[PDB]
Design a protein around this nucleic acid. Structure first.
Lengths: 163, 340, 675
RNA sequence: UAUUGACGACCCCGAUUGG
């Protein structure tokens, strides 16, 4: 690694972020490709003609998730889900998912869990001292947005095959 | 659209020693802009400005791209420098104008779109030249840029960014929403004035057997009933049309005639704007249309006018008769006029 | 008169022409054969109009107060959506379209047995996978009742008073016991005298028990063994529990999957309906004092499943000499399910539209969205430019701190089968006198259709005057002041069941709005203009409080401000920037109305338009009832007494003459005694 | 054979297109 005080460390930081961003986009799209993986991560699945939940319910959540610019914004997403969970009819819309409301809450709250799912060896994609922790804390908000967006989009394709 | 301010010219006489060293070390001779500006008349190219002065009659808004917590349907806002303002995007004004333009053309031709796909619905005469068409290479390119442009329109009201965030993040319509709206409307002291500007409202779907709300079908709108709006600027590139008609300035007349028909219907409230147009929103009054042609062809000079009659009778009858003749002549044989 | 009725929705199979389903006319151009333009409409109110602004509501003790909604000029603001939903529902009626808004209705509705039905329940168990019956020494009479005045099938265990202790036995206890035959009135029963757990010695025979009041001893004493089916103190005058006697004669039947689903579903009803009350920690049903929850509703899903050794009351009859079992029930007098879910009684052509081809007339005119998938259509109609014409239109009763309390706007309860169910899919009212079970019972049953709130014709002058006074105890000209919540102990009942309003838009106020219409056919336009030109004393219904009579409105046309033309007439208009004439559609308006009526006659096969059922019923709705009978919610007492125990009229009705809600066109008024 | 008494609020957005 570079010493943190090495003059070019600021320049290396630009390279690190660009390489991480593309790797995250790829690996999220890899996991979105599997109909088991969407069920593991969010609990969305296809059952006969239907999707659980309905696409509109994903679209609603997707519209909120774009407000997750920074980790402190986990308030907003947690605020949404608790407001969702309080309305019984809307809560049961997420029945027949795999625990989906809890899975989303975990992914939005547990700082580790996004990286555990994506499971990227960042070691070949980093060169700065402590770059891994600096970049994980940096990119967390974008990793979440990238993964959920990929899953919802990829799920829609498999719905069309079944529909 | 972009504008230049703070124009500074620095000069360096690099042919001579004082210049080259000034460039290396003394950062140039200052020059004033005003002297050189006086030396030339600004030679603006042929264009027509169209200024539409209007207000919401029923509430007007474009839907924000995500639902709130307290209020389900919110107006769209945009940043404008320091502040946020409500916005109607130009694309929405362009789209409703294109819709009425297309409807009029097809009506005259008794053409149909029920069987065409969406893309084939867009591609019809005169609107192709005014509003443009997608680039589509065909064994030749059918695509050309729309000669008509429209600006974003913003509310006369503005708010700080956090004030609007207080509305978006509100949770109780009887509760923390009411401070936020009193703040955001700028009447922290007086709820009634706030709600003469932004008024929340409830809606329900009634089950036809039982009456009362159908389960889950309860929803609410933040209706901007009192938000005042700036005049809409529509900007028509006469020069770009002249290229599409190969210089045959006479053949401008029917497209100009169509545009006046579009504006006539708009002023007659026939064109709603924004969200909810069938649900008690979007109907606008037009108080004034200002037409401002620069470097027009002389046969179009009577356009330089301000109109307050919705039927455009403030424009000269002889000029309207001329266009009406060229219009009827084109209706009788609605060729692809941009083909020479 | 009950304040609501239904216009019968007719099943639309084989409806052709424009009243039938069709591909939509579309927005892409004005058709030469169809009409477009702007209609000017004037609305004026007849009864006061409620327009509560929930955004300005206020709360005290969870009682709610609403001011009248006002617009940016300070006039009362009338939501055009509220006009739209008024007109659409009236349009859906007179066109008999698809019903645009239908909620869940897909589970079977629940109801309760009358107490008579308990006398034909038999104690029962499931053994492995067969139900078993334990009539014991009693024998099952033909109707299922215990035969020939023999004693009740189960023995009675004194449990909350004259306890027969061994600690008190519990629902799982297998037991041996002595019992004594006891008499009361019309019937007799085995009073338990002494008890032991099954393995223990019961001991010596007891003797001649006390006459516990009207429970008279006989000294006829017996020994039995079996199970105590103790539940809980689930009604205030429950003295006893019951115990099942395996010691004596028995019968069995294979457990059908039908009986499984009924039990599961019924126990699901019990456990879920009361969930909130249990979860906030109530000890018993709020509807009665002293009682505590029946055992099954507080139990786990282990009670919901029907596992080996579980116990039930079973409903059985002797049919062709065969004891056939119909249901399993946890309690002698039971909640039950009608056998059909209401959605399944509605004709598929009347259900909300499900594809782009089946769009019925109202769906085309007003637009539609598929609630189940892709599919939508922008309505051909816009209401706009709503204004109040008057300035002082708001009846502030005198000071802004006043607010009038306003009836009880209770939730509709379609469990009332004799009101909401139809004996045929043409909407025929059910027959009087039959039990509840007759309700949602055959697929050839129907639903009563589109609910309508008839006009409160014949109100007395000044009925709306001085509204804060509790005139409710005075039959002014024979009508009690019905909208006002009565006073209790001389004070206002600002309870959590009713809203209160700071005022209303005065009657005889006037409003304008315009209707924009596109590509209407001559039939669709004929229908719409007919609604806007109804003869006098016909009124539409608008806003809230419609059962109380609020929001009755007169609609009529301003013919000089209206402008309508066919597609060709617009080609002429768009063909020139110079001004041009308009056609005088006022010569055609009557013709389009006749075009509409003839379509109704032809497709619904009826000798005259005014005697099509939904047309007649709708007109009867908008004209209001006319026997000068008062309109109010059912109640046992002519005076609206403060407690408003409206339900006891329904219990009186149930034991009494069992009237059904009249056919709307028959204009029949309920008797105040339904005995 | 038909008696036992009187209370209680509800819905909170739904469906779809996402290039």
């Amino acid at each position: 690694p570079l010493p943190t005080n090495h003059p070019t460390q600021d320049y290396a930081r630009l390279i690190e972020k660009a390489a991480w961003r593309e790797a995250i986009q790829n690996k999220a799209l890899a996991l979105a490709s599997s109909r088991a993986k969407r069920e593991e991560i969010l609990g969305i699945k296809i059952m006969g003609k239907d999707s659980q939940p309905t696409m509109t319910q994903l679209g609603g959540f997707r519209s909120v998730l774009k407000r997750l610019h920074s980790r402190n914004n986990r308030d907003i997403v947690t605020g949404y889900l608790t407001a969702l969970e309080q309305v019984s009819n809307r809560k049961e819309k997420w029945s027949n998912t795999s625990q989906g409301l809890t899975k989303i809450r975990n992914l939005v709250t547990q700082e580790n869990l996004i990286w555990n799912h994506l499971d990227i060896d960042f070691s070949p994609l980093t060169i700065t001292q402590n770059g891994v922790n600096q970049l994980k804390s940096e990119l967390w908000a974008e990793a979440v947005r990238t993964l959920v967006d990929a899953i919802i989009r990829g799920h829609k394709r498999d719905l069309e095959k079944a529909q | 659209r972009i504008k230049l301010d703070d124009l500074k010219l620095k000069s360096f006489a690099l042919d001579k020693p004082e210049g080259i060293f000034s460039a290396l070390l003394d950062q140039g001779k200052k020059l004033d802009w005003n002297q050189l500006k006086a030396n030339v008349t600004y030679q603006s190219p042929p264009y027509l400005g169209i200024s539409i002065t209007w207000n919401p009659k029923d509430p007007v808004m474009v839907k924000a791209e995500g639902d709130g917590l307290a209020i389900d349907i919110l107006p769209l806002v945009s940043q404008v420098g320091s502040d946020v303002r409500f916005v109607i995007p130009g694309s929405s004004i362009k789209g409703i104008l294109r819709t009425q333009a297309e409807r009029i053309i097809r009506t005259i031709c008794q053409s149909n779109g029920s069987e065409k796909n969406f893309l084939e619905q867009l591609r019809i005469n005169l609107v192709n030249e005014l509003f443009g068409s997608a680039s589509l290479s065909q064994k030749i390119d059918l695509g050309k840029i729309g000669a008509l442009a429209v600006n974003d329109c913003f509310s006369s009201l503005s708010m700080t960014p956090d004030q609007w965030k207080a509305v978006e993040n509100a949770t109780e319509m009887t509760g923390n929403l009411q401070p936020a709206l009193k703040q955001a409307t700028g009447y922290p002291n007086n709820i009634s004035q706030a709600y003469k500007v932004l008024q929340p409202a409830m809606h329900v779907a009634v089950d036809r057997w039982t009456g009362g709300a159908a389960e889950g079908m309860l929803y609410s709108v933040l209706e901007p009933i009192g938000v005042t709006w700036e005049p809409i600027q529509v900007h028509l590139d006469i020069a770009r049309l002249k290229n599409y008609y190969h210089g045959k300035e006479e053949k401008l007349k029917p497209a100009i005639a169509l545009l006046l028909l579009v504006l006539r219907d708009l002023a007659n409230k026939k064109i709603p704007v924004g969200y909810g147009t069938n649900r008690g929103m979007g109907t606008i009054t037009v108080s004034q249309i200002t037409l401002n042609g620069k470097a027009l062809p002389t046969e179009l000079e009577p356009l330089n006018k301000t109109m307050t009659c919705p039927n455009l009778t403030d424009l000269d009858e002889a000029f309207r008769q001329d266009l009406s003749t060229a219009w009827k002549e084109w209706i009788a044989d609605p060729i692809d006029l941009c083909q020479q | 008169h009950n304040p609501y009725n239904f216009v019968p929705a007719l099943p639309r199979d084989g409806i052709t022409g424009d009243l039938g389903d069709c591909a939509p006319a579309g927005h892409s151009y004005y058709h030469g054969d169809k009409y477009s333009g702007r209609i000017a409409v004037k609305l004026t109110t007849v009864t006061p109009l409620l327009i509560p602004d929930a955004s300005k509501e206020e709360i005290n003790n969870n009682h709610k107060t609403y001011p009248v909604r006002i617009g940016k000029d300070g006039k009362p603001y009338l939501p055009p959506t509220s006009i739209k939903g008024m007109l659409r529902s009236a349009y859906e009626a007179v066109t008999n379209s698809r019903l645009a808004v239908f909620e869940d209705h897909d589970s079977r509705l629940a109801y309760r047995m009358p107490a008579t039905m308990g006398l034909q329940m038999v104690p029962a168990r499931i053994e492995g996978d067969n139900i078993v019956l334990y009539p014991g020494t009693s024998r099952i009479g033909n109707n299922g009742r215990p035969a020939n005045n023999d004693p009740m099938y189960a023995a009675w265990l004194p449990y909350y008073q004259n306890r027969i202790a061994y600690q008190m036995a519990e629902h799982g206890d297998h037991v041996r016991f002595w019992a004594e035959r006891y008499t009361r009135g019309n019937f007799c029963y085995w009073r338990v005298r002494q008890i032991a757990r099954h393995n223990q010695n019961l001991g010596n025979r007891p003797e001649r028990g006390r006459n516990y009041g009207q429970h008279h001893s006989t000294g006829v004493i017996e020994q039995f063994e079996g199970f105590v089916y103790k539940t809980n103190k689930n009604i205030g005058n429950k003295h006893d529990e019951r115990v099942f006697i395996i010691d004596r004669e028995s019968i069995e039947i294979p457990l059908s999957r039908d009986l499984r689903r009924k039990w599961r579903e019924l126990i699901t009803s019990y456990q879920e309906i009361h969930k909130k009350e249990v979860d906030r920690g109530d000890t018993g049903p709020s509807a009665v004092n002293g009682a505590v929850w029946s055992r099954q509703i507080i139990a786990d899903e282990s009670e919901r499943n029907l596992s080996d050794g579980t116990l039930c009351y079973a409903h059985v009859k002797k049919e062709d000499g065969q004891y056939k079992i119909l249901n399993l029930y946890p309690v002698m007098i039971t909640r039950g399910l009608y056998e059909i879910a209401p959605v399944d009684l509605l004709d598929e052509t009347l259900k909300p539209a499900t594809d782009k081809k089946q769009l019925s007339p109202a769906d085309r005119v007003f637009g539609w969205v598929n609630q189940r998938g892709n599919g939508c259509y922008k309505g051909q109609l816009r209401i706009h430019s709503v204004t109040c014409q008057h300035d002082d239109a708001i009846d502030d009763f005198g000071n802004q701190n006043f607010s009038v309390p306003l009836a009880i706007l209770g939730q509709p309860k379609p469990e009332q089968a004799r009101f909401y169910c139809a004996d045929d899919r043409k909407g025929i009212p059910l027959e009087d006198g039959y039990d509840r079970d007759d309700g949602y019972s055959d697929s050839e049953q129907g639903l009563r259709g589109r609910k309508v709130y008839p006009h409160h014709k014949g109100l007395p002058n000044g009925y709306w005057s001085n509204p804060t006074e509790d005139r409710s105890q005075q039959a002014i000209q024979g009508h009690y002041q019905e909208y006002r919540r009565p006073k209790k102990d001389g004070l206002e009942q600002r309870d959590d069941q009713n809203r209160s309003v700071k005022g209303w838009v005065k009657p005889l106020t006037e409003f304008t709005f315009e209707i924009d219409v596109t590509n209407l056919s001559e039939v669709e336009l004929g229908a719409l203009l007919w609604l806007l030109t109804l003869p006098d004393l016909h009124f539409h219904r608008l806003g809230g409080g419609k059962p109380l009579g609020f929001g009755s409105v007169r609609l009529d046309i301003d013919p000089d401000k209206t402008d309508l033309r066919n597609g060709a007439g617009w080609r002429d208009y768009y063909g020139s920037l110079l001004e041009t004439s308009q056609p005088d559609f006022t010569t055609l308006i009557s013709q389009w109305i006749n075009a509409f009526q003839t379509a109704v006659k032809e497709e619904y096969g009826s000798s005259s338009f005014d005697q099509v059922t939904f047309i007649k019923a709708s007109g009867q709705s908008l004209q209001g009832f006319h026997d000068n009978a008062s309109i109010h919610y059912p109640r046992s007492t002519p005076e609206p007494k403060p407690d408003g125990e409206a339900f006891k009229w329904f219990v009186a009705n149930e034991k009494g003459r069992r009237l059904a809600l009249p056919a709307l066109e028959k204009s029949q008024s309920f008797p105040i005694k339904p005995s």
